[PDB]
Amino acid sequence: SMIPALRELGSATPEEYNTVVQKPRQILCQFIDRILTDVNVVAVELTSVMLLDFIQHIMKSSPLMFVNVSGSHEAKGSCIEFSNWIITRLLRIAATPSCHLLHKKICEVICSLLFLFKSKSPAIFGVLTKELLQLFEDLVYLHRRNVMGHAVEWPVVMSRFLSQLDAPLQLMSMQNLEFIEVTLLMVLTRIIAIVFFRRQELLLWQIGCVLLEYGSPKIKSLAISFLTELFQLGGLPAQPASTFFSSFLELLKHLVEMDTDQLKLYEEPLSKLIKTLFPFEAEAYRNIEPVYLNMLLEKLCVMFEDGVLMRLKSDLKAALCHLLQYFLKFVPAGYESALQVRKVYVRNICKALLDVLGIEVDAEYLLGPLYAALKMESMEIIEEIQCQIKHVDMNQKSILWSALKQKAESLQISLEYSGLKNPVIEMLEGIAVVLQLTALCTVHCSHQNMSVVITWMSLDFYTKVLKSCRSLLESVQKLDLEATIDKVVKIYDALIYMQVNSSFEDHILEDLCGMLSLPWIYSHSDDGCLKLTTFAANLLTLSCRISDSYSPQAQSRCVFLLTLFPRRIFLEWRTAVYNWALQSSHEVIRASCVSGFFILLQQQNSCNRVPKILIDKVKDDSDIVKKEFASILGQLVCTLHGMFYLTSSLTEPFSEHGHVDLFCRNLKATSQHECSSSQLKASVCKPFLFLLKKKIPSPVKLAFIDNLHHLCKHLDFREDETDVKAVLGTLLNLMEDPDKDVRVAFSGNIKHILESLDSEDGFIKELFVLRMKEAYTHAQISRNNELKDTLILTTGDIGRAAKGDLVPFALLHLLHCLLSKSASVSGAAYTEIRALVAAKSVKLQSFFSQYKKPICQFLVESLHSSQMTAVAHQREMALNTLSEIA
Amino acid sequence: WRQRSNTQGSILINLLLKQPLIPGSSLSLCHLLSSSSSFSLSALREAQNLAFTGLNLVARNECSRDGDPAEGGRRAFPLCQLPGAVHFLPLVQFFIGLHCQALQDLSVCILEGFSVTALSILQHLVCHSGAVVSLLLSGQGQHPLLKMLLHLLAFSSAATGHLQASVLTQCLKVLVKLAENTSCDFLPRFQCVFQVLPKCLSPETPLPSVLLAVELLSLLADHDQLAPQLCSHSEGCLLLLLYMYITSRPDRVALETQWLQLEQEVVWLLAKLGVQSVRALTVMLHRQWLTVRRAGGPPRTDQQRRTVRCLRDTVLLLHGLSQKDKLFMMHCVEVLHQFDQVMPGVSMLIRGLPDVTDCEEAALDDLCAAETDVEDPEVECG
């Protein structure tokens, strides 16, 4: 409140400034006391929140008030003591449960306080952090007395941060204790970034560890999040790793015998700790000792013996399955334990995985585990048939694959016997699991995917499943009709993945075509080929059942699959289904149908130009369809060159976006990449370059960015001088596109565009000259330096990717910037030139020799402009330019 | 909490009885007893029996139980007393004595592989007993193994080779372990071992030894008397070598992930140097900012996340030095262009991080070097 003192703070000399700043400190302390006279003032309702906000505000406005910048060691001790008084007030607030419930600003005050005491002087920061760590040590020692059965001493003053301002840290319950632990864990998570000192961090490890070993579930979660923050920086020291992994094992064991909300309150920190301690990146196992992870392995083993997947409540189960993945594929077999011990481990594992596969509602977090296991099985089978041609069967070689077959056939025969007596959603779920694992293995495990002829599940089983899902489309009473047909189309996508690895017989293929066209056939029942096709006369009724109830996402799925069929079967029918789904309102069906048609067109005919309907789709915005369209046209530029041929790539699910559908969508389409096919006079880019334009929203331009390398490697720049010149002018409009991330994206892209350019001609060089010139004029017009930075990074990119004649251009296009006075252009573009002369495999000075004539002419012109706009001033500015060029 | 992790809280006999902790050489311990190879089977079999007895002891050792209330002291994470590894110490003492005798003369090489396996053994030992490390430090030539491992550090400081190159790494491991396992009072007696670190600070030492040395420097600077003594050197207060290692980048096979570990350890050490009270900071910020700015969003990979946090605490250290000392600005003029381009970039990038600090953010608002220019002549450009 003493505003005059708060203003004269700076004018006062420090020796008495300390007194005249203690005075407003004492007034604010009186403001605290009028609240902190009684610990139970009125209520918390969650008044004092405005008081805490005013404290934070006085602090932001007057940082020098709370601590002097001149140090003044004695006054430094005084302000330390005053901050300690404030800390005691807020800590005795945090001890009372209701008042602790006000933690939101209760952090903010001391959190920012330590921030600012660090910013002003690091020594004060270290002292205050050591004080807070002593308090935390006292707290965890109290909890150790609790867990060890000692005399607990419930009533304790615990005078920490004590002061003589002229401060009880009262504790009467485990709730008071755990709540001061809440506040401590929060402030520690906030301050962990700077308190990392390679020794103090070990103390933090120990204290958070002993807190994790015994504490309330919410305290457990907060400590679990603190431990994540710790591991994210210092890895894991071997010393606390013992207690940490012991606490981890006991927590895992408890997880089964945990209440629902008790799980929920630490679910996400637990999963974060899994992902952090077990990252996807390989070599992550080298950080931790193999006996540690071996006991972790046996722990996960006995957990799966408990059937945790069924016994637990929350599927976010996904974390433990991701941990299982970490073990299996990232960590080699034979490092933690022996390969036989790890083998029997994963044997019990996959058996429990089968038992839970029998009954599950969703399979995403389970299918990946099975894929990894069967993948390693495939690899070891390939190794033991290293060169033997040999026809091999994993239903015989893999006991796991045989058990998978047993599960599949058992669920399918239970279906056939009675679909009503079984969990139609979950039985069909498991059937889908095994089937799309098979198909994933069909396209991945097999030796043709990396001499060995594998035999997967037979096709008679597949047509048995076809008849089964037909009977389901019959026998449902259409309860939900939504989730069930979603499962059926999952089975369908599994089948079509099996076909994209190896095509089917044309009649069973037709059966599949009809299975996918059955939905909304009653929306398009009246066209030419509607009566010519043979599946309609039998689907009619079950399709009448699915007329409007069919979900639009499932429409997307089935239309995509129908497009993925070869052109030899009902080509015009695929055309018709697309045209019906061409301009429909829903975003998902539009995206899927266009992503199917970018192959369906070349399937039909005219594999040289974009269809007029796809041009209309260029015009129609539906911007999300436009970004997925930018991606699928980055694909179209190849499948319009190749003969609509897709490539069966690996595409292991290294990132699962929850429900992963349309595996063929994740599968790539290739070109034949012949010399005639690869070249293309643009003829399609005009709508593409329209999509490039700045008025088009930025994310679709970013998808175009992503596709840029592909679409230029499939584009010819040999002829059509002015047309290819306009294509390049649009490539540089992409540089003038307002978003800066798109600009640096185009820089990294032109890095490859230059080599994709078959031969750097003269006219394109002059186009670059003039376009980058006008870009620089526009940038200096805006006076915004971000434009100059994006442009100079583009110059360095094009220089590193330059031919003989372009490198002096880009070299001088940054040299003038550096010449005037620009500083960023040096440490960016000059370093790019250094990397380039490393790519030129020459000395930077010898490189200067080959371009010393343009360089010297440009230093000539810099000195000309300097001498003409203006002696000692000329000398100093010329020497500045010379030292920069130096 | 009843088993007390006796098995983990022990020597980790599972670890002690495990395939070579070091990469290769396929050892395990009595394989060495099977290996009849302080120069005789005399006292060799004595140390072997002492080590086997100590192993049986640690197997039967339950020093800490149900929560370990006995382990007390200022040293956080006091492991346990564990008198068992004491009896294991004579074996590594004898093997490292043989190793030091094989090093002092201009011999055989297998003893050096046995030596580095013994160093890994020591690392395991000091990893799990506070009483063990306390006697290691306490016992002038006290505990001749300590003086002879210092002599090994000196022997490896020159004429590196490959075996001694590994000796550097494992000995730095065990020292930083012994250092970190010791309380503040033991740092004054750790000063004798600290006197050897300047030779490990020579521009020759490889990156793993370098980062372990920086960890040791941090552990020593946690002491209030060891930090000024270490800063009492000649070249740059013993930190000139460290800073020029940042800028020099001596190794190209060393992955920039390991370089980033080195950088984070260095900046945390210097931050501690601040709490107990430019060229290199700028060049590492240059490299890291190039790497992060080439990416258009938050680091999805963990290595680049650590890189971003390195940017965070590096600009923290930068603003700390500038507010502490105003010579920072003309210590910057020689690198002013790098600085004026990294500072705005890294500050915008950390603004891209949703979490805030308001201290590092106050640092951003304090430095905020912008636009690096006035304008460039558009005439005769490019």
Cβ–Cβ of A126/B272 closer than 8 Å?
yes
Residue at A195: amino acid letter: V
> Rounded to the nearest 10 degrees, how much is the dihedral formed by the CA atoms of A578, A580, A586, A589?
-20
| Whether the Cβ atoms of residue A491 and residue A432 lie closer than 8 Å to each other | yes
Flag whether residue B286 sits within 8 Å of chain A, measured between CB atoms: yes
Closest chain A residue to B348 measured between Cα atoms? A786
- How many C-beta neighbours within 10 Å does residue B81 have? 17
**Residue of A780, A783, A828 with shortest CB distance to B378:** A780
Cα separation, B351 vs B344, whole angstroms: 10
A50 in Cβ contact with A3 (< 8 Å): no
Whether A119 and B359 lie within 8 Å, measured CB to CB: yes
The single-letter code of the amino acid at A11 is S
Radius of gyration of chain A (CA): 35
Classify A384 as helix, strand or coil: helix
Q: Give, as one character, the DSSP assignment of residue A283.
A: T
Length of chain A: 886
- Whether B72 has its CB under 8 Å from any CB of chain A: the answer is no
3-class DSSP assignment, residue A152: coil
Which residue's structure tokens are 């390398």? A709
- Cβ pair A206:B180 closer than 8 A: no
The alpha helices in chain B, defined as continuous H runs, are: 6-9, 13-16, 30-34, 44-60, 84-104, 110-126, 130-138, 144-157, 163-181, 186-194, 197-200, 207-221, 226-230, 240-248, 256-275, 279-293, 302-324, 336-352, 360-367
Report the residue of chain A nearest B324, measured CA to CA: A121
Rg over CA atoms, chain B: 24
Name the helix (H) or strand (E) containing A624. Answer: helix A623-639
Residues 6+ apart with CB under 8 A from A768: A728, A732, A798, A806, A809
A566 shares contact with chain B (CB less than 8 Å) = no
Count Cβ atoms below 10 Å from residue A6 Cβ, excluding itself: 18
Decide: B175 and B193 in contact? Cβ < 8 Å: yes
Instruction: Work out the angle at residue B263's Cα, subtended by the Cα atoms of residues B257 and B267, and round it to the nearest 5 degrees.
Output: 150
A835 touches chain B (CB under 8 A): no
Structure tokens at A644: 């609509």
A147, A810, A861 member nearest B380 (Cβ)? A861
Q: What CA–CA distance (Å, rounded) separates A431 from A845?
A: 68
Helices (H), A306-423: 308-311, 318-325, 339-357, 364-384, 394-397, 399-417
Q: How many CB pairs under 8 A join A and B?
A: 226
DSSP code of A447?
G
Q: Which residues pair with A356 in a beta bridge?
A: none
Classify residue B59 as exposed, middle or buried by CB count within 10 Å of its CB (0-12, 13-18, 19+).
middle
In sequence order, the 6+-apart residues with CB closer than 8 A to the CB of B63 are B9, B70, B80, B81, B82, B83, B129
A487 burial via Cβ count (<10 Å: 0-12, 13-18, 19+): buried
Token reading at A578: 């697309």
**Residue A83 — left, alpha, or beta (φ > 0 → left; ψ -120 to 50 → alpha)?**
alpha
Q: Which of residues 291-350 of A touch B (CB under 8 A)?
A: 291-292, 294-295
Q: What are phi and psi of A398, to 5 degrees?
A: -105, 115
User: Chain B within 8 Å of A233 (Cβ-Cβ)?
Assistant: yes
> What is the 8-class DSSP label of residue A284?
G
Question: Which residue in chain B has the smallest CA separation from A292?
Answer: B8
Which CB contacts under 8 angstroms, 24+ apart, belong to A469-474? A469/A428, A469/A515, A470/A515, A470/A542, A471/A415, A471/A416, A471/A419, A472/A415, A472/A419, A472/A424, A472/A428, A473/A518, A473/A542, A473/A545, A473/A546, A474/A542
Choose among B15, B77, B302: nearest Cβ to A291.
B15
- Determine which of B8, B326, B361 to mutate to test the interface with A (most A C-beta atoms within 10 Å): B8
Distance CA(A281)–CA(A104), nearest Å, equals 36
Does B211 touch chain A if contact means CB atoms closer than 8 Å? no
Nearest chain A residue to B277 by CA: give it: A123
Test A122 with B271 for CB contact under 8 angstroms.
yes
Of residues A798, A719, A705, A706, the one with CA closest to residue A758:
A719
**Which of A251-289 are b and which e, b meaning 16 or more Cβ less than 10 Å from the residue's Cβ?**
bbeebeebeeebbebbbebbbbbbbbbbbeeeebbeebb
- Which resolution, in Å, applies to this structure? 3.8
B295 chain-A contacts, CB cut-off 8 A: none
Which three-class secondary structure state does DSSP give residue B222?
Answer: coil
Token pair in block for residue B278: 């430019």
Residue of B nearest to A232 (CA): B306
Q: Which residue among A120, A126, A780 places its CB closest to the CB of B375?
A: A780
Q: Taking the CA of residue A444 as centre, how many other CA atoms within 13 Å lie in the half-sphere pointing to its CB?
A: 23
At A82, phi and psi to the nearest 5?
A: -70, -45
Name the residue in chain A with its Cα closest to that of B125.
A239
Contact A816 B67 (CB under 8 A): no
* A contact residues 145-164, partner B, Cβ 8 Å cutoff: 147-150
- Cβ distance A865 to B379 less than 8 Å, yes or no, reads yes
Both tokens assigned to A333:
């077999």
B101–chain A nearest CA distance, Å: 31
Question: How far apart, in Å, are the Cα atoms of A334 and each of A377, B124, B227?
Answer: 15, 21, 44
Beta-bridge partners for A453: A391
Q: Is B252 on the interface with A (CB under 8 A)?
A: no
Apex CA B78: angle with CA B72 and CA B81, to 5°? 85
Of A122, A243, A776, the CB nearest to B320: A122
Q: What is the DSSP letter of A165?
A: -
DSSP secondary structure string for all residues of B79-116: ----SHHHHHHHHHHHHHHHHHHHHH----SHHHHHHH
> CA-to-CA distance for A465 and A546, rounded, in angstroms?
20
CB contact under 8 A, A126 and B275: yes
Question: Which chain B residues touch A276 with a CB distance below 8 Å?
Answer: 302
Q: How far is B360 from chain A (nearest CA, A)?
A: 8
